[PDB]
Design a protein around this ligand. Structure first.
Ligand SMILES: Cc1cc2nc3c(=O)[nH]c(=O)nc-3n(C[C@H](O)[C@H](O)[C@H](O)COP(=O)(O)O)c2cc1C
Ligand SMILES: Cc1cc2nc3c(=O)[nH]c(=O)nc-3n(C[C@H](O)[C@H](O)[C@H](O)COP(=O)(O)O)c2cc1C
Lengths: 306, 306
């Protein structure tokens, strides 16, 4: 006896494992290039230096990866969401107007990535409805740029710094070291404390990141179109479609032909998410004047540059 | 003669791919049980439901994963750094004083995780100095808790929210939607902008996250133990040892046998990292009074709870 696994509910469960984001590329001697956004990448071995990913067996790009003797792994930085979206959708020329260099074996390498790996195709292994492609790394580029994150269906970023030592007996002892008493560290630890308050409440009310973002954006109806919407929620199109379907089942959203609109329940759920977020600062700043609180927001906007 | 890339430079480069953190567990019919912290996990296939990970061929736990018919994947939450560290070090009893449940095939399952996957051992594939273990998922748990991240040798958290539209001619148009105009959103965008200023300057200096943290902490924690140090910098032991070896070869750190100590050049680098962080806010808040900046800092600390 083997258990039947629902594939969409299993896909949602996998969204709990955060990953960076890559684009796998290859080009033949002929001149045919492929590039495929992928988060199935991981490392295997240091010597020999080996990495792997999993490509759909129905992919139109599989033939080129199978034939080309070399392929590249581009680790996207936080600034490359547009690249990630371009190479996630079939089109006539995914590379149109992209700048890229040629590594060994004609590997296409994008500029401004967090890192890149030039691989020789090493082995191809059966993987259910995917093929597992194992590559030997023969060259790499390590730039260190802050990476693009993919988690619970949505694009995010890495929050810097180790946490405060919150059981310390001394006042300055809360900092991991005294040079962490600085404005940058304080801001990251304020975010971390806000998230620790807000996140469990959002989750206990039954919303995951991708659902939450669609509710908050669709409530305001600011350019409610498919390309405009993707840009605002920072999610893949495949994840927008999946998340509007769930919201539809919860009675929160209507998919009227071309665009999406919340229902009255959906509007109330969006507003409930706002009140949760605003709850923490309401409590923490209850004893500050309106002027002080107005001032705090303005200094925040000054660091942001708005 | 066989040419290979430097394994330790390669490991550093792989640090650019962010991942979650798992513990892999198994218990055989004879009662032998294992748990291994791992971040080589990823998904393979939706139908059949397949995932994989890679384990070191010299692992003393491999024999039990090879014997057990079933194994678990526990996706760790942000609050489980202690569990992560516990299951990353060889030990007489990793499971001592740890609460856990048993799944199918007596899989050890930990409490308070982000998610967990019960697998039947499906296939073991040659992986250089690792074995690639493929699992068929027979049951999953989807809790959605904020995840533990691992990036450039160190533990971090997720920075939430879609980025604001910096090219907006209107104040409202900056936000992905109007309900994102709240304190929590503004804090995360503040962190984003700060990091976009700080990060390329820390990179230009040659430091990755693991090195930077060690510098900042060791600059004032001149006598910390190896346990306290792991807790303070939020890095596993194995990364601390790798990072201090790099810092030693750069001339920034000495290992006198008992403790780690920064050199004169190490101290100067720690203070430079501090200046970079402090310089952004110093420029932006120049126009505010001495007491206005004091008020801002005090309000941040109220948010934190210190
Ligand atoms: C975040 C993200 C991760 C993805 N990861 C993978 C992957 O690991 N493997 C895969 O085959 N497709 C993945 N895709 C989908 C492919 O990008 C998509 O099928 C492909 O670009 C379609 O073009 P093709 O049919 O020419 O391959 C991913 C898409 C997104 C948005
Ligand atoms: C964040 C992190 C990720 C790790 N990932 C892996 C991995 O993917 N594969 C592996 O074999 N070991 C990995 N390790 C190391 C093992 O956890 C460690 O070697 C093991 O627990 C040693 O015990 P054993 O010799 O009894 O297996 C990782 C350690 C850490 C801290």
């Amino acid at each position: 006896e083997k258990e039947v696994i629902d594939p969409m509910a299993f896909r949602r469960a996998l969204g709990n494992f955060a990953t960076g984001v890559t684009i796998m590329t290859a080009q033949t001697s002929s001149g045919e290039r492929v590039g495929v956004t992928a988060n199935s990448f991981n490392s295997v071995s240091l010597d020999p230096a080996l990495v792997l990913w999993s490509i759909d067996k129905k992919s139109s790009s599989y033939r080129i990866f199978e034939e080309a003797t070399h392929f590249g792994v581009n680790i996207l930085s936080a600034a490359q969401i547009e690249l990630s979206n371009r190479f996630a959708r079939r089109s006539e020329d995914k590379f149109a107007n992209i700048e890229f260099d040629l590594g060994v074996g004609n590997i296409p390498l994008f500029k401004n990535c967090s890192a890149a790996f030039e691989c020789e195709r090493y082995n191809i292994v059966e993987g259910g409805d995917h093929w597992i492609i194992i590559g030997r790394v023969v060259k790499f580029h390590d730039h260190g740029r802050s990476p693009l994150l993919y988690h619970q269906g949505a694009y995010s970023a890495v929050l810097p710094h180790p946490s405060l030592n919150m059981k310390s007996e001394t006042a300055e002892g809360v900092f991991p070291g005294r040079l962490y008493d600085n404005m940058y560290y304080l801001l990251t630890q304020a975010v971390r404390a806000y998230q620790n308050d807000y996140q469990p409440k959002q989750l206990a009310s039954g919303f995951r990141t991708s659902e939450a973002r669609l509710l908050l954006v669709l409530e305001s109806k600011t350019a409610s179109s498919k390309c405009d919407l993707q840009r605002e929620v920072a999610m893949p199109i495949r994840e927008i479609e999946e998340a509007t379907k769930i919201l539809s089942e919860k009675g929160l959203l209507i998919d009227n032909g071309q665009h999406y609109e919340l229902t009255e329940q959906g509007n109330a759920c969006a507003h409930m998410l706002y009140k949760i977020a605003e709850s923490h600062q309401e409590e923490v700043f209850a004893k500050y004047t309106v002027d002080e609180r107005k001032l705090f927001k303005n200094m925040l906007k000054d660091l942001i540059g708005i």
